[PDB]
Amino acid sequence: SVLTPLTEKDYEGLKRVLRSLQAHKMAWPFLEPVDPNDAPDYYGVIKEPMDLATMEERVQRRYYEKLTEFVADMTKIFDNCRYYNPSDSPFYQCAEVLESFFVQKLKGFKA
Numbered sequence: 843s844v845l846t847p848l849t850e851k852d853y854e855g856l857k858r859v860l861r862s863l864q865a866h867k868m869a870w871p872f873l874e875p876v877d878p879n880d881a882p883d884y885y886g887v888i889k890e891p892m893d894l895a896t897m898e899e900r901v902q903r904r905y906y907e908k909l910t911e912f913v914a915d916m917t918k919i920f921d922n923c924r925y926y927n928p929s930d931s932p933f934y935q936c937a938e939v940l941e942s943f944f945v946q947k948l949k950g951f952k953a
């Protein structure tokens with residue numbers, strides 16, 4: 843189940859998944875913490891920001907104890923983008939595309 847404790851072998855898969863996402867062409871808005879210059883009032887709207895650089899740090903530090911927690915931070919990144927941005931937005935579409943890529947990759951890691 844997704845509650846099972848992460849092993850050292852699992853962490854190699856998570857590193858692989860994370861780097862697949864960082865390399866994706868649509869991932870550029872999510873690579874680093876949002877710069878307030880790039881999004882007005884972002885940190886007034888979004889009370890739990892998340893990004894792929896923060897998850898990478900968390901992976902390197904063995905922050906994650908069960909896969910569900912890794913999935914949770916990833917889903918915040920997508921949730922935040924879709925709440926902050928209107929469905930019209932190319933940033934919104936970036937979340938649509940990258941979340942679908944994440945599901946494919948997550949299914950693969952689970953297998």
Ligand SMILES: CNc1cc(-c2ccc(OCCCN(C)C)cc2)nc(S(C)(=O)=O)n1
Pocket residue numbers: 870871872876877880881922923924926927933934936
């Ligand atoms: C307008 N709304 C947005 C805008 C952005 C964004 C814009 C610009 C970026 O870097 C541009 C290059 C570096 N830069 C410091 C100048 C990154 C991100 N990201 C979201 S997001 C996380 O919700 O998907 N929403």
